[PDB]
Amino acid sequence: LDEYAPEGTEDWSDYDEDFEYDGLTTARYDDHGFSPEEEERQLREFRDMEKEDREFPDEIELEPSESAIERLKRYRGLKNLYNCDWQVDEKDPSSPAEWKRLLRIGNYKNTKNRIIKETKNEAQAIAGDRIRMFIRFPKFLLEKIQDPKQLLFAVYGLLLHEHKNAVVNFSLQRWEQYDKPVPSQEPIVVQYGVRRYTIQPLFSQGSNSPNNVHKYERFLHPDTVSVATCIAPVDFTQSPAIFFKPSPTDAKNIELIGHGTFLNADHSRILAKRAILTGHPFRFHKTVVTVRYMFFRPEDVEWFKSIPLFTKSGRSGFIKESLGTHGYFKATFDGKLSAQDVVAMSLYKRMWPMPSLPWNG
Questions:
Q1: DSSP states of 36-56
Q2: Distance between CA atoms of 189 and 356, rounded to whole angstroms?
Q3: In this structure, are residues 359 and 197 in contact, taking their beta carbons and an 8 Å threshold?
């Protein structure tokens, strides 16, 4: 009778990588390189953030006085997400501690079929029978109960180890005629099976990848069905999930944000918080392009000499040498690029699922 089982700690005892981030002379690319008013203001700011995300996906502006080294010391500058060897056993301060105490389900479908078979066979009580059920129950919750003759009281069974929470991946289809901005961190009440939990689901796209790593969506996709990563008790029946938020000002105390089903109980689905840095190419020689307004110190340029440079017209290239102390540098590209294009750094961060709490009332 616990959310975090004691037997879920001994299985993940083999520490694999203990890589440090302070003893590096450059970025970690050694693998392939060298009260209603506040709510209204918050809603308007979230709409602004959503539209900014729509035109500018992961763009961050750098201040001249603030060096990029001390905010970009824990980032990852790997070339491609679908080919590099990601891992799920890293040790980072952003990892939750209770991630140590989660039941790591290897496969979901076969174990789900096995536990359905077990509930079919081992159930000594045949379905469709009259049962006197003498259950332990606390004193104070005797206050909340009403008479059963005017209110429906139902009992729903549970499977093995379902109180022990794990990493959950849900499907997200938006409600019809619905456009409310929802981020990946705000608390949404999710009713799956019968149970209702305050879940903060991290948004992503359910496109398959060879390393089971996907882009962390900061907001819900307005067109395609998204995938939701969180930590929650696992339902082995793949019940549909109703995503809502109770609203007192509305006639109903339910606000339907979306719907979907529980996809997968897999711990390997981690998220890649991406960060894209903008730049304007200043001048163009036939083979060398000198580029302005990326950094503001040359030591940034020698720190980020290994991360590839990409242009949204679809043009990749590498650095050559640091030109000046204002952030200019010379770069070698493949094709001919004009002043209307924008160049960009791409960085990635390992990003972990968060625990969830049950919802009552």
A1: HHHHHHHHHHHHHHHHHHHHS
A2: 10
A3: yes
Between the alpha carbon of residue 180 and those of residues 41, 48, 230, 244, 254, the distances in Å are 14, 12, 21, 11, 14
Q: How many C-beta atoms lie closer than 10 Å to residue 293's C-beta?
A: 17
- How far, in whole angstroms, is CA 308 from its chain's centroid? 25
Contact in structure between 258 and 201 (CB atoms under 8 Å): no
Q: Name which of 110, 89, 82 is nearest 212 in CA terms.
A: 82
Token readout for 82 is: 């679908």
Parallel, antiparallel or unpaired: strands 270-284 and 59-60: parallel
Please give the Cα distance from 98 to 353 (Å, whole number): 11
Q: Are strands 213-217 and 202-205 parallel, antiparallel or unpaired?
A: antiparallel
- N-to-C CA span, the chain: 22
Tokens of 253: 């105390």
Q: Resolution of this entry in Å?
A: 3.8
